[PDB]
């Protein structure tokens, strides 16, 4: 009629703290309608290399957006979901109703520049206003890069030093008022021609089915903005009591791998939860009060033990902005070139399928397949095991496996964590036994083997004395407990003692040749490594 404005969802699947959505609603007074649009283009929202679990999470998030639009407009507003190329869909959508502007939340990762540029050039041709808003991150990552002298900060301490100069991140924007917004009804033949979804599809519609084994799902995850704001309320409620109490309880600070999907990592990846609303609700809770207690070596004053977790996310996102080779070693200026072993498919497949013979490694990789989420310490041990603390394979193989099955699986965050853990050759402590030994770690995180028997069911009838080291059982014990090593449960795919030694020498031989390291993504110091891996020291 009078025209319409497009709020194009890729990430930022939420209605709160959406600067692009407010800009799309900025013309309600002129009769300009609103068109919520999501496009399955085969890459957006991490849909090029995706498994069933994350695809289910994304569809849960899209259904939440559509339901909120209906709830606030008495069923007048809908989320239009297409399938195809955006420039093809948007030009013909412009032919039906005159588009005045297309608003998006900035996808700062370089893997999105090609897609966003095709729409940018399409907006110049059709005289469509192209509105881009920085919102998926705490700061504009360029602002951090220009402050650091044109290069992104390569250490977590240098990133903190930069954002201290910049100041606190912006506050979340107001909530969108959709009750008075106008929406369009498209011609059914146009919805016919451009493959607009009548109902929200299932992952099977994109030929995505059960994982590499299937049904070990003990816990499940609900995507969407509504579930994200519920998990945040429960988190702040736990922090409110700890803030009033003045300290964490001893078990609240313990790594709990037997817990539940209370994590909000996937919700922050897809933008179901605003990172700024997260940051400032934690800030307002701890505001103007001096505490003394620490959480895993990090102070509690000002909620720094939580807001700092949102800094790690910002610190890996910023590093990749102007680096299109961020997910590989060859050609990456911020990654240490390490002589990894050439790809060994048998070792890689045994690591993906959780068939390494090491119980904690196998249980973590099978949980990744079943549920798509691992605790930060479980991601630590399986990353070290694949790389410097075991198989000596390239971190690129694990990055590609994580990006398919993780519920979060940010392109920059996952790649940065893989380089941070695997390619920091000058971090002496990283190669210690407190990190590379999954047996000693399994006895700390899972003393009774309950987590191991949950995801490695062949070790169910194995007693606690042998559940962490089943190869220690005698022949009579292996046959009594119905678990023969090499039949029911495979043998260790590698001799860990000789492998860790071999790999430690390769790191020492690597440092002595460079003598002085080139600037690369690395821990800031040894205290940061203790905090990163949850070391009891
Ligand atoms: C090999 C490896 C791969 C990883 N891949 C991802 C990934 O794809 N996506 C992802 O969000 N996180 C990733 N991380 C970081 C970490 O595994 C998760 O952020 C964390 O397990 C999420 O659980 P949580 O929300 O309870 O953590 P919390 O302690 O509650 O963290 C709060 C928030 O801060 C962010 N955050 C916390 N730690 C880190 C970190 N080290 N780096 C970046 N962000 C952080 C999380 O997104 C989370 O929502 C990876 C870590 C490793 C070692």
CA–CA distances in Å: residue 121 to residues 99, 107, 115: 15, 17, 10
Closest to 324 measured CA to CA, from 106, 41, 49, 109: 109
Q: Work out the number of other CB atoms within 10 angstroms of the CB of residue 448.
A: 12
How is residue 93 written in tokens?
A: 């959508």
**DSSP string of 235-267, one letter each residue:** HHHHHHHHHHHTS--TTTTS--TTS-S---HHH
Residues 407 and 266: beta-carbon distance below 8 Å: yes
Ligand 1 mean position, distance from CA 403 (Å): 13
Q: Specify burial of residue 217 (Cβ count, 10 A radius: 0-12, 13-18, 19+).
A: middle
- The CB of 406 under 6 Å from ligand 1? The reply is yes
Contact yes or no for 390/351 (Cβ under 8 A)? no
Among residues 213, 227, 499, the alpha carbon closest in space to that of 358 is found at 499
Dump strand ranges (E) for 118-229: 129-133
Breaks (C-N over 2.5 A) in the chain follow: none
**DSSP run (H or E) holding 142:** helix 141-147
Cα–Cα distance, 245 to 295 (Å, whole number): 14
Give the span between the Cα atoms of 149 and 91, in whole angstroms: 40
Place of tokens 């959406």: 18
* Residue span of the structural domain in which 451 resides: 345-533
Burial class of residue 174 (count of CB atoms within 10 Å of its CB; 0-12, 13-18, 19+): exposed
Q: Is 14 annotated as a binding residue?
A: no
Is any ligand 1 atom within 6 A of the Cβ of residue 25? no
Backbone torsion region of residue 42, taken as left when φ is above 0, otherwise alpha when ψ lies between -120 and 50, otherwise beta: left
> How many Å lie between the centroid of ligand 1 and the Cα of residue 509?
31
Between CA 72 and CA 263 the distance in angstroms is 28
Q: How far is the CA of 283 from the centre of ligand 1 (A)?
A: 20
What are the start-end ranges of the E strands in 117-241? 129-133
* Torsion-angle region of 45 (φ positive above 0: left; ψ -120 to 50: alpha; else: beta): left
Return the structure tokens found at 29. Answer: 């007074």
Experimental technique for the deposited model: X-ray
Residue nearest to atom 26 of ligand 1 (CA): 263
* CA distance linking residue 323 with residue 327, whole number of Å: 9
Contact present, 219 and 259 (Cβ < 8 Å): no
Q: Exposed/middle/buried for 139, CB within 10 Å: 0-12, 13-18, 19+?
A: buried
Task: Assign residue 286 a region (left: φ > 0; alpha: ψ between -120 and 50; beta: otherwise).
Answer: alpha
User: Rounded distance, CA 266 to CA 264, Å?
Assistant: 6
Neighbour count for residue 175 (Cβ, 10 Å): 12
- Whichever domain contains 479, its CATH number is 1.10.579.10
Residue to mutate, 376, 382, 404, ligand 1, most ligand atoms under 8 Å from C-beta: 376
Question: Residue 208 and residue 231: Cα distance in Å, rounded?
Answer: 28
Output 240-249 pairs: Cβ under 8 A, ≥24 positions apart. Answer: 240/285, 242/300, 243/285, 243/286, 243/289, 243/291, 243/300, 246/291, 246/292, 246/293, 247/291, 247/293, 247/300, 248/293, 248/295, 248/300
Helix (H, G, I), strand (E, B) or coil at 277: helix
Going from the Cα of 315 to the center of ligand 1, the distance in angstroms, rounded, reads 12
């Amino acid at each position: 009629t009078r025209g319409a404005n497009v709020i194009w969802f890729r990430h930022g699947l939420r209605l709160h703290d959406n600067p692009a959505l407010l800009a799309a609603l900025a013309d309600k007074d002129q009769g300009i309608a609103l068109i919520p649009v999501f496009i399955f283009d085969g890459e957006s929202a991490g849909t090029k290399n995706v498994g069933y679990n994350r695809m289910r999470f994304l569809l849960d998030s899209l259904q939440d957006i559509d339901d909120q639009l209906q709830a606030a407009t008495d069923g007048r507003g809908r989320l239009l979901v297409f399938e195809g190329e955006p420039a093809y869909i948007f030009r013909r959508l412009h032919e039906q109703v005159r588009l005045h502007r297309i608003c998006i939340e900035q996808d700062c990762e370089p893997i999105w520049n090609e897609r966003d540029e095709s729409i940018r050039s399409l907006c110049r041709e059709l005289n469509i206003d192209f509105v881009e808003k920085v919102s998926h991150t705490l700061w504009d990552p360029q602002l951090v890069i220009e402050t650091n002298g044109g290069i992104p900060p390569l250490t977590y301490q240098m990133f903190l030093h930069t954002v201290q100069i910049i100041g606190l991140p912006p506050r979340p924007t107001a909530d969108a008022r959709l009750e008075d917004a106008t929406f369009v009804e498209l011609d059914p033949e146009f919805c016919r021609s451009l493959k607009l979804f009548e109902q929200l599809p299932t992952p099977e519609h994109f030929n995505v089915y059960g994982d590499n084994m299937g049904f070990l799902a003990k816990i499940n995850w609900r995507g969407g903005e509504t579930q994200a704001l519920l998990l945040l309320d429960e988190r702040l409620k736990v922090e409110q009591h700890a803030f009033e109490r003045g300290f964490y309880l001893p078990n609240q600070a313990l790594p709990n791998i037997h817990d539940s999907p209370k994590s909000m990592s996937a919700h922050l990846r897809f933008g179901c939860l605003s990172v700024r609303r997260f940051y400032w609700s934690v800030h307002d809770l701890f505001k103007n009060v001096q505490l003394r207690a620490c959480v895993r070596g990090v102070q509690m004053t000002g909620g720094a033990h939580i807001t700092g977790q949102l800094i790690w996310r910002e610190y890996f996102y910023t590093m990749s902005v102007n680096n299109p080779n961020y997910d590989r070693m060859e050609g990456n200026d911020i990654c240490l070139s390490i002589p990894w072993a050439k790809p060994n498919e048998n070792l890689l497949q045994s690591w993906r399928l959780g068939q390494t013979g090491f119980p904690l490694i196998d249980g973590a990789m099978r949980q990744l397949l079943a549920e798509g989420w691992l605790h930060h310490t479980l991601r630590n041990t399986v990353a070290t095991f694949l790389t410097r603390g075991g198989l000596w394979q390239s971190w690129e193989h694990g990055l590609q496996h994580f990006l398919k099955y993780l519920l979060d699986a940010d392109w920059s965050v996952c790649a940065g964590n893989w380089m941070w853990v695997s390619s920091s050759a000058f971090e002496r402590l990283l190669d210690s036994s407190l990190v590379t030994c999954p047996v000693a770690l399994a006895k700390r995180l899972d003393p009774d083997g309950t987590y191991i028997k949950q995801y490695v069911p062949e070790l169910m009838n194995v007693p606690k004395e042998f559940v962490h080291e089943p190869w220690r059982m005698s022949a009579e014990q292996q046959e009594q407990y119905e678990c023969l090593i090499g039949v029911h449960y495979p043998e260790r795919i590698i001799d860990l003692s000789m492998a860790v030694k071999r790999n430690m020498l390769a790191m020492k031989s690597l440092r002595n040749s460079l003598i002085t390291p080139p600037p690369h993504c690395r821990p800031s110091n040894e205290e940061e490594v203790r905090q990163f891996f949850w070391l009891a020291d």
